[PDB]
Backbone:
C-alpha cells in the first residue's frame, strides 16, 4: 500500500471492478437463462411487457409531461440567458444543426420509420376501425407525436444539465453517479449508492445496445437476401454480427478514428440521398399533402395523445406504442443529452432548447413522414400485403419490401444496404467506446479506452443481439427497452434534480 | 337627535334596518308562498330553471371566459408584481396552500363529487350515447373542467380586488356596496343603489346557504338510516337541522370559537383520510389511469366545453350542468374571494393567482376523481343500479350506496357520517356569522356579532333547507342557485370594475 | 433629349408605358379569348381551379401559417415597441377601430356571408354527412375561421412593413416594386425584374376587381327584379355596370370626392343598421347561442382547419373553400395593408397588430354570424329550398331570398338594395383610383390621377365583370382569384423579406 500513493489525482489506466464486473455478471446470467428455454423466456418476456406497460405506463407518461414542462421553464425562466461556457460556440449555427440533423440517421430509425404506420393503421387508437379513413388520417400524426418536438423537448433538461456540468462547473463526467454530488453528497456518490446507480445504468445501456443490433441486423440480412440471393437465417445474422465485431476490432486496434468519422459522414449524406430519393419517387405530392394534414391533426390531438391510457375500452394502444416509445426515449436520454451538451459549448440555455428541438425534429419528422408516407401508399394501393409478409417472413422482410417497391429497385436496395451497414459499424464503434469509458478507471482526458475492454464489450453486445434474434419478433426488443427504462426513469430524474440544486447556488 | 352625535366614527352595535329587514321580509315571503302549494311551486321552479338556463345561459358562459381572461392579465400585466400589503405573508407558503386545499372539504362537494359522473355518463354531452365508451371517457374530464383550474382562475380578479381593498387601501369591507365608491360615488354607495345591491346580495346568499343545508342534510340522514336503522324521513331531516341549530346556538352563546376551529381541523384531516381510503380500496390503479386519460381529454375539449350551448341538437346538456354550475361559481365568488384575500396578505398579485389556482384545483381534482372514479367503477361492474336507487329512494341514497360498497363498509360509513356532520356544523357556524356581520351596524373590528341576530339567521337558513327538502329532488336546489346567480352576475362585475378603476389611480 | 432634363425629380403627369400597356394587353387578350368560346373557357377555367387547388393548395396553407407566426414575432419580438412615425396618431383609438370596422362593409361580404354556410352544411368537411347535426355545428365555426383573427393576423406583416416604409423611411410607395430595393437593389427594381413584378401584380389586381363586380352586380339586379319586377338578365347586368361606370365618370370628372366620401359613410352606417335589423328579427337568441357554441368549436378545430388537405378521403373540401379563400386573402393583402398602414401613423408595431386584429375580426365575425345564422335557420325550418333556387335561378337569387324571408320584406330589400349599390359605387371609385395611380408616371403627392386613364380602367374592370357573368356561376370568379393569387404569393413574401432586411439596419 505504498509509496507516494495519494499524492495526486489517480492518473492510471485499467478496469474499475466497481462497475466492470457487476454488469458483466448480470447480463451474462440473463443471457444464459434466456437461452436455456427460448419458449419460456418468450412467455416471461410477454408477461413483463404487459405488466410494466399496463400498470406503470401512466408514470412514463407523466415523466414526459413534467420534462416537457421543464423545457418551458428553461426557455422562459431565470436561466434562459445563462451561457453554457463563456467561450464562443465551437461551431457555426449551421454546422451545429447539421450535427443534430445528422445524429438522427440510424438503422433503428429506418426500421420504425418504415413500419410503425402499418401498425397504427391496422390496429388504430381511440377505438377507430382498422384501415378506416380516420385510422389513416391519424397514422402519421402519431409518428409526428412519438418522434416530434415534444419528445425532443424532454431531453432539454438533461442536455442543459450536462452542458452546465461540463462547461460551467468544468467537471469531467462519464458516469451518471458523478453528477449526483449536489444531491446526495460525496459519501453516497463514491459509496454504494453511486455504485448501484452506475450499475443499473450500465445494464440498461447494454440491453439497449443489444436491441439496436437486434433491429439493425435483420434489416441488413434481408437486404443481403434480396440483393445476392443468400437466404436470411439465424446463422447469416450471427455471421454479419461477427463481421461487425471484427470490423470494429480492426478499426479500434489500428486506431482508425479518421476512417470511422468519414464513414459517419457518408452515412449522413447517404441518408439524405436515400430519403430524398424515396420522396421524389414515392409520391411527392401525396407526401407533402399528407404531412401538412398530419400536422394539424397532431396539433389538435396532442394533449389527448400525451395523456392516453385507454382505461375504459382497454384496446391497449398506448401501452403497445406510447409507453414502449417513452421507455426508449428515457433509456437514451443521458447518452443523447451528453452528446448534445458536447456540441453546444458557448450557447445559451434558451438557444440550446430552441435549436435542438428545431433541428432534431426536422430530422425525425422528415424520416417518418417520407418512409411512413411511402409505406402507407403501398398499403393503400395494394402493392404489398404487409400482414401476409410478416406472418410468413418477419417484420424486417416487410420493411425491405416497402423499399424494393420503389423505382430502380436494385439501385435503391444498394443504397439502403450500404446505409444500414455503415450505420451499424459506427453504432458498434460508438457503443463499445461508451461501455469501455464507463467501466474503466479514470484515465487522462482525450485518451482512448483499453482496447481489449472495448472489444470485449462489443462482443457481449453482439451476443445480446443474436439472442434477441433467436427469440424472434418485436416483443423481446420492446421488453428489453421497457426493462432498462424502469431504472433510468429514476436516474434521469436524479441528474436533473442534481442540476437544479447546484444551479440555485452557482448560477446566482 | 343629540348630543355629541357626530363627533366620531359610529362605534355602536346592533342591527342596521337598511339591510336587516328587506332580506328577512323577502325570504320570509318566498318561504310562505313555496309552502302554500308544493306541487305548483315545483312547477314554477322548473319553469324558472328552464328559462334562465336556456335563454341566458350564454351570458354565464361569457362571464367565465372574461374572468378567465382577467387571470392572464393579472399574471402577466402591470399588476403582476404588486404586493398586497407591504408586510411579509402571515403564513408559510405551505400552510397557505393547506388552507385552500382545506376549504375544499364540504358536504356539497361529497354530494356532487359522488354523483355527477353518473349523470354525465347516462345522459352525455355532444350527442354521445348513454353508457357508451365515449360517454365514459369524457365523464371525469367534465368534472375536471367544472371543478378545475378554469373556474378557480375566475375567482382571481375578485380575490385580488379584495386583498387590494383590505391591504393596500386598508378599508374595512363587509358588504359588496363598500367597494363600489370608486365606481358610483359615495352618494350612490350610501344611498339607495348601495342598499339594493347589498340586499340582492344577501338574498342570493341566504338562498345559497339554504341549498347547502338542503344537500348536506339528506346525506347525514341516509348515513343515519344506514348505520342505526332509523328510517330517512322529512321529519328526521327537520330533527337533524334542529340539532345543528341548537349546536350552533350553544357554540355561539358560550363563544366556543376554539372548539369550532378544532372541529374544522378534524373535518379537514378526516377528508384526507376518507379520500385516501376510497382511493386505496376503490381501485387505485384504475383511478390513476382514468385520471391521466381524463386530463388529456379535458385539455383537448376545454375550448369546446367553455363555449357549449348545444343550439342545434338541443340535448340540453350545457343548460343542465355548465350553466347551473357556473351560477354556483358566481354565487360564491365574493364570499370565497374574501376568504382567499384574508389568508393572502403580503403576497404578490401573480403569487396569489398562481398559488390559489394550484392549491384549490389540487383539492377539487382529487375529490371528484376519487369519488367519481369510485362511482364510475360501481356502475361499470353492475355493483349498483343507480337509476333504480334514485327512482325509489332519492339521490342521497344512491350516493351513500357508492360509499357503502367499499370494504369495511360500516367503518367507512362512520367516517363519512362524521365528515358530513362536522362539515355542516362548521358551515352553519360560518354562515350565521357572515349573515350577522352583514346585517348589523358597523361594529369595532375583531368583535363577534350580536348573538340573537346570529342565531336568528341560522334558523331562517334551516327553514329554507327543510322547505327545499319538502320540495324534493335536485331541481329546487338548482333553481335557487340559478336565481341567486342572476343578480350576483352584476354584483361580481361591479366589484371588479371598481377595483380596476381604483387601481389605475392608486397603483401607479 | 434636352434641355435641363435631369436637374430634379421628374414632376410631370401622364401614363408610364412600363406598367400601363402590358396589363392592358394581357387582360385584353384574355377577355377576347374567353369570349371566343364560353363553353370551352369554362372547361379550362374548371381545369385550372382543380389543378392549382389540388396540387398547390398546401403552399397557400403554409403561407398563412408562416404569416400567422410572423404576427407573434411582431407582437412579442424586438420591434413590438417601435413607433410607426414618431408623431401622435392622427385618429383617436375609437375612430381608428371604426375605420377598420367600416372597411369590412362590402358587397362581396354580403355574398359570401349569406351563402357560404349553405355549402358548408350541405357538403361538409371531415367526411361528415350533409345536413347532419355535426355539419351544422361546424358550419359557422368554419366562417369564424376563414374570416376571423387568423386570416387578419396574416396581414400584420405587410401592414407593419408598409407603415414602416411610409412613416419611418418616409418613402412614397405606390407599386410593390418600390419596396424591394433593400432586397434586390435599385438596378433590379428599376429594371426588368421590378417591371415584371409590378405587371403581374396589376394583372392580378385587375382580375380581382372584376370579380368584385361579378359578385356585386347580380346581387343588385336580383334586388331590382324583386323590388321593381324587372327580370334579371345578362343585359340588365350590362346596363347596371354601365350606370356605375357613368356614375364614376361623373364623380371623377367633376371631382366629387366630398360626395363619394359621404356615400362611403352612408354605406357604413347602413351596414350596421341592416346587420342589426337582421339580428333583431332573424332569431337573436339562436344567433347569440349559435355564435357562442361556434367559438368553442372554432378554437378546438382551428389547428385541424389550418393544415387541412383531405389527402385520404379526397372529399375536396379544403380545396374548394380554404385554398380559394386563402388566395382571396393573398390577392388583397398588399392593397388592404397599405390602407391599414395609412390610418396607423404614430401607432406602435404591437398596437397595430392587436388593434387591427381586434377591430377587423369584430367586423367580419359579426357579418358572417348574423347573415350565416339567418341563412342556417331558413334552411333548418324549410322556409327555403336553396339547392332548388340555385339550380333554377343562380346563387345570387338564393341569397336575395334569405334577405326577403325576413319581416318587413319590402323595406328590408330596399335597405339591401341601397347597401349593395352604394358599396359598388365606392368600390369602383376606389378601384379606378388605384389602377390609375399605379399605371401613371410619378406625380406630385396629394394629386388626383389623369381622369381619362382613371375612367378607362373602370371600363376594363366592367368588361371583366360582364364576361364573368356571361360565363356564369361561381367557378369563373373563383379561378380568377386563384390565378391572381399565384403570382402575389411571391410578391407578398418579397415585400415582407424586404421589410425584414431593411429593418435589421435602420431599426437598430
Ligand atoms: O422570481 C423567481 C423566478 O421565477 C420564474 O419562474 C417562472 C418563469 O419566469 C416562467 O417563464 C415559467 O413559465 C413556465 C412554467 C411552466 C409551464 C408548463 C406548461 C407550459 C405551457 C404548456 C405546457 C406546460 O414559470 C416559472 C414559475 O412557474 C423564473 O425562474 C425567474 O424569472 C424568476 O426570478
Ligand atoms: O402599456 C400598458 C400596459 O398594458 C399591458 O397589458 C397587457 C399585458 O402586458 C399582457 O400580459 C396581457 O396579456 C393577456 C391578455 C388577455 C389574454 C386573454 C387570453 C389569454 C390566453 C388564452 C385565454 C384568453 O395583455 C394586456 C393587454 O391586452 C400591461 O398591463 C402593462 O405591462 C402595460 O404597461
Ligand atoms: O436576441 C434576438 C431577438 O430575438 C427575439 O425573437 C424572439 C422573440 O423574442 C419572441 O417573442 C418570438 O416568439 C414568437 C416566435 C414564433 C412563434 C410562432 C408560434 C406562436 C404561437 C403558436 C403559433 C406559431 O420568437 C423570436 C425568436 O424565435 C426578439 O426578436 C428580440 O427580443 C431579441 O433581441
Residues:
Amino acid at each position: 500500500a505504498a509509496r507516494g500513493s495519494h499524492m495526486k489525482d489517480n492518473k492510471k489506466a485499467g478496469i474499475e471492478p466497481k462497475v466492470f464486473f457487476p454488469p458483466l455478471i448480470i447480463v451474462g446470467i440473463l443471457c444464459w437463462l434466456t437461452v436455456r428455454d427460448l419458449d419460456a423466456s418468450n412467455e416471461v418476456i410477454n408477461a413483463v411487457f404487459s405488466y410494466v406497460t399496463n400498470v406503470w405506463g401512466w408514470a412514463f407518461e407523466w415523466y414526459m409531461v413534467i420534462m416537457f414542462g421543464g423545457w418551458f421553464w428553461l426557455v422562459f425562466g431565470r436561466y434562459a440567458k445563462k451561457r453554457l461556457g463563456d467561450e464562443k460556440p465551437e461551431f457555426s449555427t449551421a454546422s451545429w444543426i447539421f450535427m443534430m440533423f445528422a445524429s438522427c440517421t440510424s438503422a433503428a430509425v429506418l426500421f420504425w420509420g418504415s413500419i410503425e404506420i402499418y401498425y397504427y393503421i391496422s390496429s388504430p387508437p381511440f377505438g377507430m376501425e382498422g384501415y378506416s379513413a380516420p385510422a389513416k388520417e391519424i397514422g402519421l400524426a402519431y409518428s409526428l407525436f412519438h418522434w416530434g418536438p415534444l419528445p425532443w423537448a424532454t431531453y432539454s433538461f438533461l442536455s442543459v444539465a450536462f452542458a452546465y456540468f461540463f462547461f460551467v462547473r468544468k467537471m469531467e463526467v462519464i458516469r451518471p453517479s458523478s453528477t449526483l454530488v449536489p444531491l446526495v453528497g460525496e459519501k453516497h456518490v463514491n459509496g454504494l449508492f453511486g455504485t448501484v446507480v452506475d450499475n443499473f445504468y450500465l445494464v440498461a445501456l447494454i440491453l439497449a445496445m443489444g436491441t439496436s443490433l437486434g433491429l439493425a441486423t435483420p434489416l441488413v440480412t434481408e437486404c443481403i437476401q434480396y440483393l445476392f440471393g443468400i437466404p436470411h437465417t439465424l446463422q447469416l445474422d450471427a455471421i454479419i454480427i461477427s463481421c461487425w465485431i471484427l470490423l470494429n476490432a480492426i478499426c479500434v486496434a489500428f486506431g482508425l478514428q479518421k476512417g470511422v468519422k468519414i464513414a459517419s459522414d457518408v452515412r449522413t449524406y447517404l441518408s439524405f440521398l436515400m430519403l430524398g430519393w424515396v420522396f421524389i419517387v414515392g409520391g411527392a405530392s401525396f407526401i407533402v399533402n399528407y404531412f401538412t394534414d398530419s400536422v394539424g391533426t397532431l396539433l389538435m390531438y396532442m394533449p389527448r395523445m400525451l395523456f392516453y391510457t385507454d382505461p375504459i375500452g382497454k384496446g391497449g394502444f398506448p401501452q403497445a406504442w406510447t409507453v414502449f416509445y417513452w421507455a426508449w426515449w428515457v433509456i437514451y436520454a443521458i447518452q443523447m443529452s451528453i452528446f448534445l451538451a458536447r456540441i453546444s459549448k458557448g450557447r445559451t440555455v434558451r438557444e440550446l432548447c430552441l435549436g435542438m428541438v428545431s433541428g432534431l425534429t426536422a430530422g425525425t419528422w422528415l424520416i417518418w413522414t417520407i418512409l411512413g408516407g411511402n409505406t402507407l401508399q403501398l398499403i393503400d394501393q395494394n402493392i404489398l400485403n404487409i400482414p401476409q409478409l410478416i406472418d410468413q417472413y418477419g417484420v424486417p422482410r416487410a420493411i425491405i419490401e416497402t423499399w424494393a417497391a420503389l423505382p430502380l429497385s436494385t439501385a435503391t436496395m444498394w443504397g439502403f444496404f450500404i446505409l444500414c451497414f455503415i450505420a451499424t459499424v459506427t453504432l458498434i464503434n460508438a457503443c463499445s467506446y461508451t461501455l469501455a469509458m464507463s467501466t474503466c478507471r479514470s484515465m487522462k482526458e482525450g485518451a482512448d479506452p483499453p482496447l481489449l475492454v472495448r472489444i470485449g464489450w462489443s462482443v457481449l453486445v453482439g451476443i445480446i443481439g443474436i439472442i434477441l434474434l433467436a427469440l424472434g419478433g418485436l416483443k423481446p426488443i420492446q421488453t428489453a427497452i421497457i426493462a432498462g427504462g424502469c431504472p433510468l426513469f429514476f436516474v434521469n430524474i436524479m441528474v436533473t434534480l442534481s442540476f437544479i440544486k447546484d444551479a440555485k447556488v452557482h448560477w446566482k
Q: What stands out?
A: Residues 14-508 of chain A form one domain. Residues B 69, 72-73, 76-78 surround 5-cyclohexyl-1-pentyl-beta-D-maltoside (ligand 2) (CB under 6 Å). DSSP finds 20 helices and no strands in chain A.
